[PDB]
Design a binder for this molecule. Structure first.
Ligand SMILES: O=c1[nH]cnc2c1ncn2[C@@H]1O[C@H](CO)[C@@H](O)[C@H]1O
Ligand SMILES: O=c1[nH]cnc2c1ncn2[C@@H]1O[C@H](CO)[C@@H](O)[C@H]1O
Ligand SMILES: O=c1[nH]cnc2c1ncn2[C@@H]1O[C@H](CO)[C@@H](O)[C@H]1O
Lengths: 282, 282, 282
């Protein structure tokens, strides 16, 4: 059926967290595949396994520890999802996005989303960071949407707009911050396209995606952005280009989850530095 | 699971309606968002709330009264759905299309469908009326189809063709009728594309849709057309262009349901006049 | 819910087959619409109705007998599915692909898939045989995937690659074999695109599909290939172009299942000869 959580369920979970930590975060960060390292830079950290927080789902994917960590990052109080949920695990979108609404009830105002993605844009190189300026929601085209079913007015409106989903001001900040880091490569920016997974794309599918105007492909994030914007959260996000997708039938190798995680550690020091510095801007 | 209604369920509902009204309609009209006004031009009208008709689903969307009205429009006896059902409300396609099969069992032969849609075609202006000459069924591409499951031979064939879904003769009639109205703008005609909703499209999604050859985007209608053609109903339909979709990231505003309903009243007098005059042609 | 079969279920079904036939096939063939004739060339054949094999689903589509036949084809021991399962029948992808995993447990190493498809490529003519070199999985884009849910490590990895799904060596063999047959028309090769069905495509949908780079359209096969590659089966397949899809609104006729089955018998002698000769190559 549709959404199985009532407003009270989100409320109960929020109260439970509030009664177990003195931390009052204003920023929420969702760590994607190979990005779980961002957590180790938190000060005064407190961790909760998803399995001990009442109505919380569980991460089953390698590279997703499945822990909620509160802490202080570069002066800002925040909460981090060290690992997320995906539709390919068997979860409905209303389960995948449960934490987002709980965050809103905690008093969070900004949500930063991260993920590992395949590069469709030929100008992209493995290791690149791409600011997400827009998305294409394939599952949404068929009715698979976290907002399907009766609307909860206490969270948002029935027909939320998505054209302004990725905060313009934060993207300007991201660009200025990147410049201060003195990096050699430029910060990329583009359209993220989501598909269900869990298998990797065929050559025909990649060419099709690129021709639709997508710069990177992945199996998450979009559902969380929809719910985030629906409840009024300011959203900012980026993809770590973990590999160049095969575009020719004379393909040498083939995508694998290992390459994705390996790439994560390689860029760890870089993107961790980036996110921490970004905390100064709000 | 698949379709939960058996042939008998449609039959029972049809018998109930037949035993409560002397009206024997030959035309059925489904009113979309902001089009519920078409009903007020009916003579000898009889209304039934969806909630009192046995196996009927219920409209939960603003702009959808949720009433079945029988009456005489410009000499033709017809039945109107003042408000329809959508997949984003949590309804399976076999629930959304329930009324269509009941209509067939009432003895209806023609089905006219209406809806509010976003304009993808740059030549479209807010207020335009677009005859639907074809559709692109996105949900259908993934298997979400009102005909999924065992086929009911009493209604139609297992593999119904859709290339001739929108009646050619009625579209010629629509054009001749529009000319007699002396309108200033030309009657548009194009391809309607359906996606699940309920959120509005991103810029990337709109560009993608337009490039696929779609002229207008919406969250309904197609399921009803499939079932209508499957059971042998002559189908004709049109979209009221309620807004121009944002195609640039330097977007001024963002889509909202209010604009859609406001647009409906603006064109009310026009499209109501159009549909009533169209009744003369069958 | 997700996959309802546990590893043991596939195992039980495999043991049942092994205890009822002395046949030990190395090749598995799935016959599509109008291709059920391939079975009549088997020697020392043994047939099982799907309804008598424990955890087996059932074919409900005309042109799909619904029988598992073991036999010897041109010296090679193989098993054939005379008729397959489709999502439009009401089956979840984990039911549609059940036989594929059972085959793996029987000791099968190669899977050849066949199907009836509509030609999108203008160079295609009715009667053509198209080797599938790649596919576009539309249902997969929305999360409808036979691998959705927890991964069974005993079968394969969590994130299987699909870029090398259609065996290169077998496609070279197919081309050499076709030459030896002395056929007049060339063996086609292209991208197969899958959509849910059961209705046939509209003109707008066909133009869209062709523009995405698809050569033929159908309502099956892809799910079986995903599971086959996930568990390590070598895969090879081909489509019988049963009709040219309508690409213009001044359409003369409209697609029908009859034309599909009629086309099957016409090419029967040809494709049966092709598959039997192909058995010599492994
Ligand atoms: O090339 C890619 N295509 C699709 N998803 C990808 C790709 N690269 C990374 N991911 C993402 O990382 C996990 C798989 O490693 C998936 O969760 C997917 O969202
Ligand atoms: O721009 C648009 N995109 C998608 N659906 C639209 C648009 N404009 C109108 N509708 C239609 O009207 C309702 C929302 O107001 C939805 O039911 C949708 O089908
Ligand atoms: O033009 C076509 N479009 C879509 N599927 C087709 C077409 N031609 C053959 N099939 C395939 O044959 C059955 C219907 O006859 C369906 O199972 C479909 O997979």
């Amino acid at each position: 059926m549709q959404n199985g959580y009532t407003y009270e369920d989100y409320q109960d979970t929020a109260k439970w967290l509030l009664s177990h930590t003195e931390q009052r975060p204003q920023v929420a960060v969702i760590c994607g595949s190979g990005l779980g390292g961002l957590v180790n830079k938190l000060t005064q950290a407190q961790t909760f396994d998803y399995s001990e927080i009442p109505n919380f789902p569980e991460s089953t994917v390698p590279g997703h520890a499945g822990r909620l960590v509160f802490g202080i990052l570069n002066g800002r109080a925040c909460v981090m999802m060290q690992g997320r949920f995906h539709m390919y695990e068997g979860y409905p979108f209303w389960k995948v996005t449960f934490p987002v609404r709980v965050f809103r009830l905690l008093g969070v105002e900004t949500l930063v989303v991260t993920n590992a993605a395949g590069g469709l844009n030929p100008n992209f190189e493995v290791g690149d960071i791409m600011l997400i300026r827009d998305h294409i929601n394939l599952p949404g085209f068929s009715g698979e949407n976290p907002l399907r079913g009766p609307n909860e007015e206490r969270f948002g409106v029935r027909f939320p707009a998505m054209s302004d989903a990725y905060d313009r001001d934060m993207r300007q900040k991201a660009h200025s911050t990147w410049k201060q880091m003195g990096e050699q490569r430029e910060l990329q920016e583009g359209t993220y396209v989501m598909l269900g997974g869990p298998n990797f794309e065929t050559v025909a599918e990649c060419r099709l995606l690129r021709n639709l105007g997508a710069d990177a492909v992945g199996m998450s994030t979009v559902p969380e952005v929809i719910v985030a914007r629906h409840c009024g959260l300011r959203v900012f996000g980026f993809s770590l280009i973990t590999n160049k997708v095969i575009m020719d039938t004379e393909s040498q190798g083939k995508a694998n989850h290992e390459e994705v995680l390996e790439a994560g550690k390689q860029a760890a020091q870089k993107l961790e530095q980036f996110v921490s510095l970004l905390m100064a801007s709000i």
